[PDB]
Design a binder for this molecule. Structure first.
Ligand SMILES: CC(=O)N[C@@H]1[C@@H](O)[C@H](O[C@@H]2O[C@H](CO[C@]3(C(=O)O)C[C@H](O)[C@@H](NC(C)=O)[C@H]([C@H](O)[C@H](O)CO)O3)[C@H](O)[C@H](O)[C@H]2O)[C@@H](CO)O[C@H]1O
Ligand SMILES: CC(=O)N[C@@H]1[C@@H](O)[C@H](O[C@@H]2O[C@H](CO[C@]3(C(=O)O)C[C@H](O)[C@@H](NC(C)=O)[C@H]([C@H](O)[C@H](O)CO)O3)[C@H](O)[C@H](O)[C@H]2O)[C@@H](CO)O[C@H]1O
Ligand SMILES: CC(=O)N[C@@H]1[C@@H](O)[C@H](O[C@@H]2O[C@H](CO[C@]3(C(=O)O)C[C@H](O)[C@@H](NC(C)=O)[C@H]([C@H](O)[C@H](O)CO)O3)[C@H](O)[C@H](O)[C@H]2O)[C@@H](CO)O[C@H]1O
Ligand SMILES: *[C@@H]1O[C@H](CO)[C@@H](O[C@@H]2O[C@H](CO)[C@@H](O[C@@H]3O[C@H](CO)[C@@H](O)[C@H](O)[C@@H]3O)[C@H](O)[C@H]2NC(C)=O)[C@H](O)[C@H]1NC(C)=O
Ligand SMILES: *[C@@H]1O[C@H](CO)[C@@H](O[C@@H]2O[C@H](CO)[C@@H](O)[C@H](O)[C@H]2NC(C)=O)[C@H](O)[C@H]1NC(C)=O
Ligand SMILES: *[C@@H]1O[C@H](CO)[C@@H](O[C@@H]2O[C@H](CO)[C@@H](O)[C@H](O)[C@H]2NC(C)=O)[C@H](O)[C@H]1NC(C)=O
Ligand SMILES: *[C@@H]1O[C@H](CO)[C@@H](O[C@@H]2O[C@H](CO)[C@@H](O)[C@H](O)[C@H]2NC(C)=O)[C@H](O)[C@H]1NC(C)=O
Ligand code: NAG
Ligand code: NAG
Ligand code: NAG
Ligand code: NAG
Ligand code: NAG
Ligand code: NAG
Lengths: 321, 177, 323, 174, 321, 174
């Protein structure tokens, strides 16, 4: 024979396959995937801040204090809000909350939140404050929203209310109030004694005048009446002014609010997972430095780019044989 | 491949070489064995590592809050969000798929290039002192011991020293002897 | 001496491609990945015919403009075709509330069935013969076919308290309106009640409408207006009406089933008796190419719209001259 | 990126090569003719088809309805849709134009590489039994009949068979 | 001792560095950046059309003629509008302008603009037209918006107004009007003598009916009252019909308007720079053909694509040694 | 590099070559000096210039008006604009950064291929009349003078004129 020297390259037992522009299913000695497909399957803190989880309540029910709602405790700060797809206890008394979607966006991320008593029930000496409905039961007994007061005639009289509250605190106040729509002239007199009625609300920027619509409506929660609720943000040292001669759903509790960032509302049925994450999805949190993922499009946080892909496999080794 | 070495004239890789990506196999009267070229292997590993890191590090991620915040009387705006969300999914998917396809083709051609460069360096040293087999191997016309093999591996192969001994062997095969 | 040579194929092609480093390079073969051809007609989308309104707008077709010929009844469609400026939109001037959101809702409809819900005979104490010259059918005054102009009977307008329960198994689109009269004399002459209102209530809708008595500018020869509203009445829910004047009552409603969404296409063309996956206002396109430069306003599964005349990929070799 | 063969040391293609992309031309005592190399041509065809199909098939398309559904008091929203529409057109146009430009460069270099590899495979078989003229051709020292030429075109060239015959002629070049 | 010929490549003293997909910080003999990083720091014209620069006034204040607003002389055409971030002068009488953001977008780019006197004060013979307020001072003296008229009672009477105006000009007309909300029943009678008033506005398309909201409000610029302003585009040969018995802030001046292009409001504190450009940013203009820039995201014109990068350096020369 | 020349078997560029991107260095009895290959340089200049212009001129730019036109009760809509703006910035940044990295690699390998093709061109003319040193140089056997050197750079190397003279030398060292 004769002495020989040869040039060659590595080969192993790997079966990893990659695709190229010109070739498909090429076996390589080593490869790396740049697509993220794994999540922990739990709802986590977003950068160490716990989310607000409204288990069986919508935002409107939680804010107004639905009697079947406040199983909660004080959460002073949150990074996002988890609502179930169809919450059960939204609005015990049928009606609407005005600008509901914008209000939900505003509350998605809150730096400081604290319920505070602003107008106690003793501030209505000439009005009934025990307005109670069966559509708002607490343990079967009829009740009402915990944070607002149903004002009713007293001694066959509804004196015109001319009251105000001044925000003496150092933070913004989210304040909610409402107007009750009656069904007929008889019910209107039986509740407020004043057939023609109004609710006027004014601040440095708000200028609102509401009049009830007395008409027949389809029953909801066994009720034909409606309660339309409204809200405002009262700046510090500003005052809100209320004038009403009937159908007023007065505020009792308000919320000190401080906003420094923005988020959204996450629709998910899962529960808190006692974990931290940089990126959250409705079905689980993701911890990845990979540029792409295929887990879920409705993400909150710093996340890889969403793609419709099963694998993004980069060849890092040699062609195998 | 592009450079014709891997799966070209060099048929198949070496399961027996475990110490590197590219290198040499030798056979003489003392014995045989594989030796890995550390310089090209390390450069290729660093380049490939940089490639993966570049594909990952250049991505820019910022905080976003993706939800469904529009009501039944705002379907037109939600359609705008749907057209936007699907637009970015199409853009990112196509770019991610084609980037992987294009980078894998270049990576395989990169390995093919590295092997050919190693082959060519040996061929220039040996000249007619060894016969090109056309399969990535060189058959020496002279006795090349373990020290001679290392000289070929590290570039210090001395052509004139073996030029005579090689020349006599060329005649023997030429004359049918 | 005998010779063997290496070489490559050359032909008579003049196709030119461009590279990142060279321009106008002749190649032996090439492929264009930019779709540029459309059939020039309006087609079905995934086997479902569109809705084509020739002289009518969505508002006029829904409310029953007499000038809008009630041609056929399409039980379902994939998208709606309108002209840029239709001729018969609102014969009596006014507005349709949330017209664009309603138009978006009707772009793709799984089932559509016009239905009589409140017959003219259910107004025994009111006059239902209201007509107008701005709404002419066959050259004589007429009105919208699906709503009824309620005027006074025997110098009286009793307060209406009427409720309709959706007994069908499908959603009901119901349209009603209020008529804005020109002055106090006209208000008395038509409804006899000087202070009037229109109240509409469902499980979710809670609406009160009041007429606006003032002088406007003339439109279609008229100074009055008719503002129309709508709602989606869910099955087994009741809509409650209450009015003492100026009430434009509903006669015909529409059973509706919605399974998907679409948009409205502004085209001046008509049916082309064809099927397509991707429709444009100037013609459908059928291709698997990733890009097209036809038209931005596409409906369907379409290639990516680009501002480009050619995207030519070289497939053969760099070609040689004539020898 | 060029490999030096196409429009390089091989100056122009052949109109006579009608059955393949890359091939051989031979001239000996029995005559002359062209012969396409089926293996490398098929590999090139399969690869180039894969490139086109990859560029086409990797595109994800979904149903979209694009119209103008905003009225004269919603011009701010329509401007938002315009900025999104124009942004996607700008992204797709730039990417598609450059992808075509980049892949056209790669395809032409792929063909150049294949021709060069075909040249090298012949050179390694022949060794000193022929001399390369530098134009992509080899001049044989020994007599290479059609069967010999076919052995070069496939992989079965018997170098030892003509070793002495070429050696004697290589010495007689004086 | 044999002759030699060699093949080699150029090398120079360049220290320019580029990155490749596989190597970082590679010194090349020549390189070229394709990222634009330079502006002129000036507010320029856009394609030969000067921007409307409202120095210290908001669009509403400039439109309504706030007395503190200078004038900015007759500018009949502009390509875009420059506002300061927090303008000092806006509605001096507190209130709102309806569809303000849509109006601002409509006026962002205007082909022809001309203030026109359409209803002189002489057209109000039975009403007082001299209303002023200390919230709208001019040189320390109570004044009012220069383009609208505060109509009030005359000789203990506010006769019902039934006025119309036909747009005889050949151009579209932007007409501004408003309604005033009083603070109490006594003040309402003090100014208009009619306890229940309204404003009715009508065109070929507009059917409007406003009613004052007489309720308590917080003081803004010393005032608890509010003025709510509205607008319309009166088409040529169309007539607008006004109708009120009180609280009416009548139009005096209106604007001839021609629109054939669209733009946006730019928030910037900079001043006019007597320059021209195709691309304007709030901190400067860009004259470039480069495909990318990193100056500012809020650009107006034909601009490079904005990116988050500090350099995009293309290698042109060889690997330098 | 992908090809073997730049920072390969030619271990560094020539500071002394002030004209041209690629060229030759000669040493003989008459003297020494540099001489650039104008055709290879000009072709490389045209190629690189076309690349930069293609990256620039293929960008489609459109009049856009970018501002913040939504109020405090439209904060959902601006988030839609925020997501749209941030998405395009991410797309453009990623593509631009990757485009530079990819094109720079191709550019460096382009120069590498050009040098290698020039080296192979010289080796084709010289053939056995000179010895490759493995460092980009050719050691002659036949006393190449200045006009002889010009013929190699020109491409008119008269191989028969020197074949004998180099043959006699070649046997001396063997
Ligand atoms: C105060 C009272 O006894 N009122 C009698 C009516 O309740 C009754 O009409 C019946 O009302 C039924 C529902 O009654 C509630 C409810 O929502 O559960 C009863 C609540 O006490 C009452 N709350 C307050 C603060 O007064 C609430 C309220 O009256 C209205 O619902 C507000 O919209 O109503 C149920 O709907 C029955 O169908 C209806 O007949 C009438 C006639 O029997 O007598 C009233 O004295
Ligand atoms: C019912 C009738 O005879 N009404 C007479 C008025 O029509 C007439 O005023 C003139 O009206 C002209 C247009 O009249 C219509 C129309 O829109 O064509 C006529 C319709 O019959 C009538 N329909 C009903 C149900 O009342 C309709 C309606 O009154 C209004 O459109 C509601 O706003 O009006 C045209 O506008 C003339 O300029 C106008 O003078 C008066 C006086 O001539 O007599 C009425 O008896
Ligand atoms: C007309 C008159 O004498 N009014 C007296 C009130 O001015 C005064 O209440 C005080 O009013 C202060 C502001 O006064 C003005 C203003 O805005 O500067 C004065 C203007 O002349 C007046 N304009 C007209 C056309 O009448 C204007 C107007 O009344 C309001 O803007 C309507 O809302 O008000 C300031 O608000 C003070 O805080 C307030 O006390 C009262 C009580 O002293 O007497 C009135 O006679
Ligand atoms: C909500 O309450 C605050 C706190 O009471 C009100 O602000 C304060 O108002 C008083 C008068 O009610 C101001 O005092 C007066 O100020 C001036 C100087 O501006 C001086 O001339 C007078 O002698 C008198 O002291 C006080 O300055 C003012 N601010 C503070 C920080 O106390 C506020 O107005 C209330 N908000 C509303 C909407 O009513
Ligand atoms: C490069 O290879 C050569 C050839 O093997 C090495 O030189 C020999 O080194 C051995 C070490 O034991 C000595 O015994 C021989 O005498 C050397 N031969 C010579 C100098 O001709 C050389 O050391 C290698 N260099 C490197 C850096 O590995
Ligand atoms: C509209 O009619 C439906 C059908 O009758 C009503 O729903 C039924 O009401 C009765 C009597 O209260 C119940 O016993 C049934 O269970 C209901 N459902 C069905 C399917 O029959 C419905 O309540 C009516 N609308 C309103 C607003 O009351
Ligand atoms: C590969 O080339 C060889 C060399 O010509 C071919 O072998 C010859 O085939 C012919 C067919 O008529 C026979 O007459 C010869 O005797 C063969 N020569 C030998 C075996 O040395 C061979 O067929 C070619 N292979 C293919 C697949 O075409
Ligand atoms: C590649 O492999 C996948 C998965 O095993 C298979 O579905 C596909 O058909 C293969 N394609 C080819 C060309 O072999
Ligand atoms: C390429 O050719 C076309 C016509 O075939 C011509 O219009 C165009 O200008 C040419 N381009 C260049 C760069 O020469
Ligand atoms: C599209 O064209 C192709 C031509 O290959 C044809 O097979 C296909 O049926 C066409 N599709 C329609 C919907 O006409
Ligand atoms: C590089 O060389 C050029 C030409 O000689 C000279 O102009 C320039 O100043 C030099 N730069 C440095 C940094 O030495
Ligand atoms: C490249 O150079 C930059 C600036 O000179 C430096 O910050 C960076 O660390 C370098 N990267 C290396 C040496 O990998
Ligand atoms: C306005 O005046 C013109 C010219 O006098 C006239 O043609 C037009 O009808 C008038 N418009 C109205 C609404 O009166």
């Amino acid at each position: 024979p004769g002495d020989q020297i040869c040039i060659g390259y590595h080969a192993n037992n790997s079966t990893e396959q990659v695709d190229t522009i010109m070739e498909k299913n090429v076996t390589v000695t080593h490869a790396q995937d740049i697509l993220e497909k794994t999540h922990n399957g739990r709802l986590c803190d977003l950068n160490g801040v716990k989310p607000l989880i409204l288990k069986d309540c919508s935002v409107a029910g939680w804010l107004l204090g639905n009697p079947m709602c406040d199983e909660f405790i004080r959460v002073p700060e949150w990074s996002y809000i988890v609502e179930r797809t169809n919450p059960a206890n939204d609005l015990c008394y049928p009606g609407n909350l005005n600008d509901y979607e914008e209000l939900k966006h505003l509350l998605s991320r809150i730096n400081h939140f604290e319920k505070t008593l602003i107008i106690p029930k003793s501030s209505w000496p000439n009005h009934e404050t025990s307005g109670v409905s069966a559509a708002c039961p607490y343990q079967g007994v009829p009740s009402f929203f915990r944070n607002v007061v149903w004002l009713t005639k007293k001694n066959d009289a509804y004196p015109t209310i001319k009251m105000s509250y001044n925000n003496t605190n150092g933070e913004d106040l989210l304040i909610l109030w409402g107007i009750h729509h009656s069904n007929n002239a008889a019910e209107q007199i039986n509740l407020y004694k004043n057939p023609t009625t109004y609710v006027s609300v004014g601040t440095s920027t708000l200028n609102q005048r509401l009049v009830p619509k007395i008409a027949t409506r389809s029953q909801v929660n066994g009720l034909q009446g409606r309660m339309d609720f409204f809200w405002t943000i009262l700046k510090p040292n500003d005052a809100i002014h209320f004038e009403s001669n009937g159908n007023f759903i007065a505020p009792e509790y308000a919320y000190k609010i401080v906003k420094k960032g923005d988020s959204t509302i996450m629709k998910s049925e899962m529960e808190y997972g006692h974990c931290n994450t940089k990126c959250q999805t409705p079905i689980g949190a993701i911890n990845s430095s990979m540029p792409f993922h295929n887990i879920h499009p409705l993400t909150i946080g710093e996340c890889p780019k969403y793609v419709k892909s099963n694998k993004l496999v980069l060849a890092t080794g040699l062609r195998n044989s | 491949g592009l450079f014709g070495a891997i799966a070209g004239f060099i048929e198949g890789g070496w399961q027996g070489m475990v110490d590197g990506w590219y290198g040499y196999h030798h056979s003489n009267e003392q014995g045989s064995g594989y030796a890995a070229d550390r310089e090209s292997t390390q450069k290729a590993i660093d380049g490939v590592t940089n490639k993966v890191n570049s594909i990952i590090d250049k991505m820019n991620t910022q905080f976003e809050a993706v939800g469904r915040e529009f009501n039944n009387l705002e379907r037109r705006i939600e359609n705008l969000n749907k057209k936007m969300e699907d637009g970015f999914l199409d853009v990112w998917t196509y770019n991610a798929e084609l980037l992987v396809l294009m980078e894998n083709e270049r990576t395989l051609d990169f390995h093919d290039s590295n092997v050919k460069n190693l082959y060519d360096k040996v061929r220039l040293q040996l000249r007619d002192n060894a016969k090109e087999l056309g399969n990535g191997c060189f058959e020496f016309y002279h006795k090349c011991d373990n020290e001679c093999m290392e000289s070929v591996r590290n570039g210090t192969y001395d052509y004139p020293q073996y030029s005579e001994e090689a020349r006599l062997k060329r005649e023997e095969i030429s004359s049918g002897r």
